Structures are given as C-alpha cells and as structure tokens.
From Swiss-Prot, chains B, D, E:
Record-linked CDD domains: UP_EcUdp-like
Pathway listed: Pyrimidine metabolism; UMP biosynthesis via salvage pathway; uracil from uridine (phosphorylase route): step 1/1
Entry protein name: Uridine phosphorylase
Gene3D superfamilies: Nucleoside phosphorylase domain (3.40.50.1580)
Organism: Salmonella typhimurium (strain LT2 / SGSC1412 / ATCC 700720)
C-alpha cells in the first residue's frame, strides 16, 4: 500500500528498524520461527514478508528473489518503510580447499561482477559490509561454536557460466551480495552478509539461520 | 526433474516448441485459460508453468520472475526443454507523453542497462527481437484494433535509480543515470522494464526466436492517473495479443 | 548551398522525404535509373546526389563514401533538407554456411564495432532498424522471388584486420550500418538496410538494387 | 592493380618514398603542380593520385577521402606501395579565439575521438606525429613568414556531434560530447578535424613517419566571418608549406 | 641488500612479521619510540626503516612515500622480507561536516581512484581491509577514549584534481572529477588520501593482512581552522592507537 | 609556506619560470652543480629543491619522488609558484635492439599506462611533449655529440609486473612521463622529457644531466 511491490505499510512494521533478507520464502518462515511473535504480513511475487520480535523489538524477514535486480527492489522498499539495517543469510559452495562443508562464511566485501551495483555507485567504490554487522555475525557464529572464515565473496549475475578469484583468496560465489553491500554502503544503511557452506569442489545450514537471528539481536 | 529450477521434465512439455513468458506467476493461469485444455504443470518459487493447446499444438506458459538473472534461468532451462520461440507479455509504464494508457508496445530492440546479457554477448551486440515474432505481435495487435507503438525499450537492472526515480529513501541517483531519462526520451525510447535485455540478447545470440509485447498501464509523464478497470482491461488485451501472435508462429 | 558538404538546397529536393544511400557514385546512377525522371543534382567529394520520382513522389539517391564518418555527414545533411527515411543497399560477403551467393540479407540490427555510432548514443543503445523499413525490404525481396535471410550484421571501421560472431548467428560484415542504424533510431528517423551476397568463405547484385527501389515505393 | 582500392602498381610510383596526402581529390592536381613533371596516375572513388618530382626524386600526391576508415585504406595501400613518409595537408577551423584565419597549424599529436585508430594501437598509445616531419613543417612555415601554432588537434569520427555542433536536425548531442568543446578549449586544443587520429596512430605504431599541417580558413569562436579570397590564399600557402616541408624530408 | 629499494636484509628484521607503515620518514622514529629497544635500520630515499620490540616480538616501522607506486614498492619488498601484517598510520582531512578535528578514522575499504591497485586485482575486486586489523584498530581507539568513525575512504592518485580542488594553477578539473566530491559525500565517504587503494588491494589479493587508521587534522567542509597544538596532539594519539593495535595482532 | 608540500614561497624562486624535475635528491644536487649560484632551498618528504642561475636567469631543480602521484604534486605546486616550463631527466632501460647503452632518448609522447594522467584528461588525449622543449633537448644532445633516438615511451605505475610495445616501436619504459606530459599539455604548461640508456635486454649518465641543463638554457 505504501510501496510499489512489497504490499506493506509503515504501520505493518510496528517500528521495525532491522530486516533479515534471504532469497527464498521457505527460508523466511524458518528464520521468523526462531523469533518471538512471528506473523506473516504479505506475499507478492518474489517478496514474502513476516514480522517478528527480538528482545521486545520488531524485526522483519523478507525474501529477495534471485539476483541484484529483485534484491534492489526489496531493500529500497524496506528502507522507505524505515529499515536501516539489513542482514543477508544464504547457502553456498566454497572455492578454497581449507573451507569445510558446515563452516560459516562472513563476507567483509564482494567482487562486483553484477550489473545492479553500478546503478548505485561506480565500479571503483567498494562493495563493503558494515563493521557493526560484520562484528555481530562473527560474534554470534563463535557463540554457537561455528567454524568461521571471514573474507571476500565473488558476486555475479549468472549461476552457471579463471581460477583468478581462488588465487586472490576469494572464499565463495553467489549472486546478491554485491548489489546489497554496495547499495547500503553508498546510501547510509548498514548491511551484513553470512553463509553456510553446503558444497566445496575441493573437499548444517540451520546454523547460519540461528547465527543471523542472534546477530540481529546484537544490532538492535 | 530434467532441469535444475523449474521442476519440469521434457515429456511434461508434450513436444511444445513455443513458450509465452510473463514475469508474474499470478498471470500464468489466465493466459493459459485463453487456450485449449489448460493444465498446471509445476510451481516452484516464481517459476509457475502451465501447458495448453493452440490449433492442436502444445504450448507452455512459464513465469520468469523479476530481473535478468531470474529470467536467464527460466529461458535457459526451457531452451534445454526444447522451447525455441519465446514471447514475452508484460504491463509497463511509458516514458513518452504521446503514448496513452491502454496503448500496446511491441519492442524491436532494447537498451542494455543490465548485467546478465553481458554473459551471453558483449555490449556491442544488439538486444534485438526476432523479425517473425515482432511481425506476429504487430499483426495480432492490429487485428484486435489496438493502438500500437513499435520501437526501442530501455531494460534496467533496477526499478529505481536505473529508471531515474528520485522519490526513494536516499533521493539520489548516481551520475551515470543523472539526466538519463531525458536522454532516452529524446532518443525515442518508449518505456522502461527489467527483463528484455537478457531475454532478447540470449535468444538472438543462440539461434532462438524472441519477441515482446506490453500493455501500457501508466505514464509517468502524464498528469492524469490511470482508471482502475482500464488497467485490468489493458492487461486482458495484451494477453489476447500474445496468444494470437503465438497462433501465427506455431 | 544550404548544407556544408552536399552542395544542395531544400528546393533541389522538390519535397523529397526519402533517400537511398549506397556507398559509391556508380551505384547511385544505377539506382536512379530504375526510377522515373532521374536527374543528377550534385557531386562534391564522396557525395554524388541524384533526384528521381516514384509514384509521383520525389526520392533522392546519394552516395555516402566509406565508413561511419562520411555516412554520418550525408545522413545529417539530408535530414536538414527534409529526409526522414533512409534505405541503405550494399554488397557483402556472408559468414554463415547456409547463406548462398545471390541471396539477399535484410539487417534487423548491427553489432556496433565502429567508432561513429558512439557519437550518437552510448554502447548500450541498440543499432536497430526501423520496423516499417525492415518489413518493406522483406516484402520487396519476396516480390521478385529473392532468397532472403533476416538478422544481425557486424559493422566495423576496418575492411581487413574470433569466430564468435558466427557462433552468435551474425550474417555478414560491413562498415556503415552501425552508424546509420544508431544515428537514425536515436534521432527520430527511419532507416533500413539490405545487401546482396557476392561472396561466402563457406560456399546477382542488380536484384538488391531493384529491391531497395521497390521497398522505397512502399514507404512513400 | 597491385593494391585493392587505389588502382596503382608499384612501378607507377617510380621508387617514390614520400607522399603528400590531402583529403579532397580536387586538391591533388594543384599541389602536384608546384612540383616538376606532374602526371595523373589514377583516379578511383576519392582516391586520386598524381606523381611528380622534387629535387630529382619521385613524390606521390594521393587523396584520402573523409574519415578514418577511408584514410586507413589509402595509407595502408600506399605503405604497401613503398611510401614511408606521409604529410597531411588540410584546411580547418580553429577552436581558440586567438587563432586567426590565415594562420597555419602544425599538429604535434591528436585527441583520439575516432574508431579506426583502435585497430592499430590501444587507446593508451598516443596519436603522435614524427619529429622530423613536424620540424620540417614548422621550418617551411617560418621560411614562408606564416603565423604558426604548434600543438594538439582533436580528431573526430563525426563532423557534427563529435565537434559539439547544435545547429543540426535533432539539436542534441549525446552526453559524452555535451560540454566537450569547452573542455578541449581549456586544454589548449587548437582545432577539430576527422582523419589525423588514424593517420598518426597507424604511422607511429608501424615504423612510418607522418606529420600534418593545415591552414585556418574559419573560426567558430570569432564573430567576424572569413573573406572570400583570404580562404583561397590560405589554401595556397598551406600547399606551399607542405611541398617545402617535403623537400627537407627526401 | 636482500631487496632492491629498502636496502634491508632478512636478518635485519629479526623475524618481525608485523610492520607499521607511515607515509613520511620523519614519523618513523617517533612511532618506534613508543616501543622497546628502537634501532635505526636503514634510510634510502623516502624508505626509512626502524626496528623495535613489543611484548618481546620484533616489529618494523617503515615509510611508504607518497602515492600508490611508491607504496607498492615498500609493501612488496617488506612482504619479501617476511612481513605479513601491515598497519597504515596517517593524518588526514575529512570530507564530512560531522567529523571533527581530533577524531580518528578506521577504514573498512577504499574507493579505488588510483592506478597501481589495478596491477594486483581488477577494478571489480574490493580494496578491503583485514577484519582482525580493523577490529584491533577500533578496539585500541576506544580503549584510548578516541572519537572514532569506521567506514569508506576515497584513495586518489592525485592531491589536487582527484580530490576536486579548484584553488590550483589552472582552476579546472576534468569532467570525471567534476562534482565528484559531492557524490562521495552523499555516499558516506569519510576522507581523501592517496595510498590505501594500493595497500589494501595488494594485501587482500595476496593473503596478507592490512588495516588503516588516521587522525583528523583538518576539515575542508568546516569554517573553523584547526589549532596548532591540537594537530600535533591528534598525531600522537593516532600513533598510540596503531602501536596498541599492533600489540593485539602479534 | 605558499604551497602544501614543497615548503617554498614565490620569493624563494626569484622570478624562475623553468624547473628541472628528476625523481631523486642525489640527482637534483648533481644538476644544480652544473649551473651558476646553486643554493638548496628546502627538503620536505620526496621534494628536495635547489635554486640556480643560467645566463643570469633563475632556474629551479626539484625532485619528484616515485610515480605519477608524487610527480603531480611537485609540478602543480611549482606552477602555483610561477613555473611554466618543466624538463624531466631520468635514466632507463631500452627495449629496442638498435638502442645502445650510452644513447640518449628524447620522448615525443608516452603510452598512458598510469593512473594519474586520467585525473587531468580522458584517455583519448595525447601524453605529448611540447615542441620547443623537444627541439631544445635534441639540439643540446647533438651539441655534445650524443647518439640520440626520438620517439614514444611507455609509462606505468609498476616497476616490475606483451612484446606489443616493442612491435609498436616504443623505445623504453618508465613511471613518470605519462602524468608529466599529460598534465602539462592539458593545462598550458610546456614539458620535455629526456633519458640516458643504462641497460638494454637486447644488447654515461652524466651526459643526460648536461643535456637537460643546456636544453633549459635554450628555453629561457
């Protein structure tokens, strides 16, 4: 009602200033289930949103869809509704031999191989994560005894179609973080990014979900 | 289960070689309804598929989702499934003052303001529609009596700054897109959308045929706002066009 | 007199709103000869112009010279004199095995490998042909029984100095269409492009000349 | 018949190793006339060639046509024919208020606003003139008593938008060239033309020598218009300079 | 003599695996002074090195010089010498009105307005600081009671036009940087400097750890000018921070 | 005092309108020693400046440091203090087989492989030397019987980390000339560049120092 795509009003958010933004609706419900007073708000196209409460404060969980373009819509419209901190959780493969399936990756910054990040800042600007959010993710991962790696993620527009990134120390590949981190860092919004390792070519997801919620708690 | 995202098998398509591709899964059923024997195949994320019949030949209707990355997945997997002709149907706003709500747009080629197309051809390559598809769309529009505009669409990786919108959280657009809307207007660009640069570039570079039609449901450059029922009536006409276009391409 | 290079006045055009623009003077005379009341108007540098009449309406035939830069001068100065539709005819080689010497190519759009097109629009803008002009060329080719292929053409600044274009379905190579199509599509002018196949590495020009004239007729 | 466009054989050149290259074939005869025993070799499209003698050595005079693509053809084929030194003669407008009609410009290097040069060297490579050629041109100008300016020229693939002209059909220039003329003016660029980026880049990158001189026949930044006969007199002086430059390079 | 510019041998470092890297050789001694047993190793050009001890472990302090090219030399040679952690200390101006003289800046990542970083990773790669280094710097600042800002720095190959300064000889800035300062301000960039894009990109892409802290000594966006002694006191605090950060990284 | 880095006033220059700008302090002293009334003015960071006199006119010698960025500071601040002509002297290797150790290279223009030149003009603008300065360097080299080559130099941001430049006739590699030539040619300042060949992979520095001084003399 207040926004073009999400089908939400400011009032729906009950003062929420933080959102957790996974890609998929099934993951949204799982995340909200970990919190208090979970309520489904809306479901339009790729954007399924729930509301919940952490330490007496409202938090929103909203799916992004696939890629920077849909992610860009979700984040902008949530910011219009008052959210100032965004935490993404995903699941990925790793490209480094020492990263084990079951490990947790906290992204400090992303390689900008997407198209949407350029709609926010020129290529020379860093797709960097917020320091508070990065710290909270690392703390919450240690809190549940997760094995954690912290570093750079490669972010692109294609799922499928060179070992330069490995030689440069890149941890993993995904499709959304470049847009998310760039759009937030260049517009006065805080953003964090965490992922669970589900596969590694050189070689247990509920953890990342718990970690993102517990991180959110430290940021309220 | 033959493909990685759509949850479809080759046999499910019943030899179908043309697909109609809306963005929104809510629209899949209602366009399948215009055809014979509509059946719901699968529904996974924003990829909802239905199969139907037109003049005795199997046709698929499948949603793409929002943006080029999502669209590329849909197109790639359906191509694997044997689809060789893709007709995009949409609803859009216009960027020219003389284009009215209720008009129909057929896109000859797109301005590539996206990222995913670059994975299929370099920027020098044109995001051009197939001649046969474009002709069928133009002829179905005219047979229906629609007011039709044929030309260039700007295809953007974002709904907000790539479309030079200022009524946003930050109120700012990066220099690349500052003044960009006036530029496209002066160049004769008809409209903005978010999926066509990917669709048209990947099909033109891979021996597949694609076209795109859209109904105008709003115009940012006009003061008058669109009527409630006229927006729903423009959507039904666009749907009619795409089906009647498909009939000529079978 | 009215323009910098062509040596023409508005009055010279006698109301003409369409021009056929081949590269070479010998081709201009050949094209004008097919029409009624052919008259040579001027010859300065690369630009040799004739006037003629089709169905009682004035049409101009004007040579462009070699490449986007000279082509850009001819088209601009003809537009200043009132032309709003431009049809190019050339002769080329093909790069696709199924294209035969004697076949006719109608270009829907061009790969922009030239420099001059960038003086009109940034690289992301399509070097696309006008739909009416494209339709008229295809119709006129069928009218005389020509074997016709319709698709993308590669357009560059060099005649001589990778099989990526073939793998991408590109029909042929030339030097002028990118500038022509981009400059017209970005400035509210209609343009079409047709060529006769004179050679094919993977392997009868009067036809293309007749086709361009008959196409012009349908566009008046 | 040794080359593909000029319609010339090696023997036709009589061992000539320097060529004077105007753009317009109308100018070929009149510069050949300043030299001994002028003979018309060939004339095909805008490639008109004449041969002459200077201090007993054979010299060629050949037109290039308009733009880099045309020029590249001329230079490439003449290089094949054994030409190793190229002197460009032209007439030009100036872009600086203090450069007067009747002045002479010798170009040290060019701003590469063209496409064809990129086929010979990447953009990082300078479109720089040969030192010996530049020196000869500067010395011939001074010996004649010409008012001479030595510096950078902007070389454009277009006469209109690349030169930021607004008095055109559309009245618009793409953002790349909006404000570009004021930029070059502030950087000390002398003039605009259309062939030098190609000429200078291809010669500098291939072990060939090139220079360029031009007579100023107009100035867009001045209110006064040029006299009729002063434009023809500036052209004859420029021609004189290039011949006298050629004498020192033989 | 093990390296080509610093005039240092491996053994000179005494197994040191962390280095503090100021720009100015005048600052090398005074930061080495905060530590145990400071000794002057070498001094060649703007590469002055001192060694010291912190909690019993050898530490190096080495100047980088001005700009990315100079810095790349220092970092490369020290890396060869076995340094694996680099902490940059500087003094800087701010570009945000709410950042006050005497505040401290810890850089999370840098805008890459330089050339040398491109030799280590493509532009798409982020000029990002190490998490452990950034954490140590932030914690040392807070332990000291400093007012701290954590975020993005713009790193430029020039002090004047890349920082959009107009009070220069020419008074002009090339279009790329015209309006650029307002752009960075709106994006939340804290400050300008000249070495970090190179430092952070080369370390992040080569398995080395780097961070950067700086004391604010001036603010172009504020009318009030900085006090004389407050500039020297901000410098001593920054130095304190970097040493105390180093203690946690050993 | 008048400038941010160099520690100089206008008065320090005593009317000087030409500077010789080598990279290193040891070279500055050597150059000033060749002239009359040499006086050290200042030494801050990379910038060590001396004043001297040639034919009764003041000249400054000031070191630049390594690379375009430091060079850019020195040249700008000297221009603010009234210098309008700059001559660089260096020592380099050659990449052409016919260039001998002991030969002298006068650069007409540079390949722009640096980052700082772009802060002054876009890539299409030539990193070209001033004609007067180039002429004076060639004359002064002939004056002492030096073997001289005149042509293009490649200029980059890295000392260490393809034979395209050789095939294109490039004489040598260094790190400063691109910034110097571009920044001067685009801002109404004259600049020249000369170097002595100290090594050649395909195969006596005081000369270049004498040559730069004698060149300066001709430009006053």
């Amino acid at each position: 009602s207040d926004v073009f795509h999400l089908g939400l009003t400011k009032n729906d958010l009950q003062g929420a200033q933080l959102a957790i933004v996974p890609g998929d609706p099934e993951r949204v419900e799982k995340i909200a289930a970990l919190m208090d007073k979970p309520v489904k708000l809306a479901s339009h196209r790729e954007f399924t949103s729930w509301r919940a409460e952490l330490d007496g404060k409202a938090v929103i969980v909203c799916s992004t869809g696939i890629g920077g373009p849909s992610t860009s819509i979700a984040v902008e419209e949530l910011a219009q509704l008052g959210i100032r901190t965004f935490l993404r959780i995903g699941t990925t493969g790793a490209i480094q031999p020492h990263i084990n399936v079951g490990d947790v990756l906290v992204t400090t910054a992303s390689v900008r191989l997407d198209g949407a990040s350029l709609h926010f800042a020129p290529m020379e600007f860093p797709a960097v994560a917020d320091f508070a959010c990065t710290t909270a993710l690392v703390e919450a991962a240690k809190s549940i005894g997760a094995t954690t790696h912290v570093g750079v993620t490669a972010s692109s527009d294609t799922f499928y179609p060179m070992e330069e990134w490995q030689a440069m120390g890149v941890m993993n590949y995904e499709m959304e973080s470049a847009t998310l981190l760039t759009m937030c860092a260049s517009q006065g919004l805080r953003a964090g990014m965490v992922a669970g390792v589900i596969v590694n070519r050189t070689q247990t997801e509920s953890h990342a979900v718990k970690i993102v919620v517990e991180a959110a708690r430290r940021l309220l």
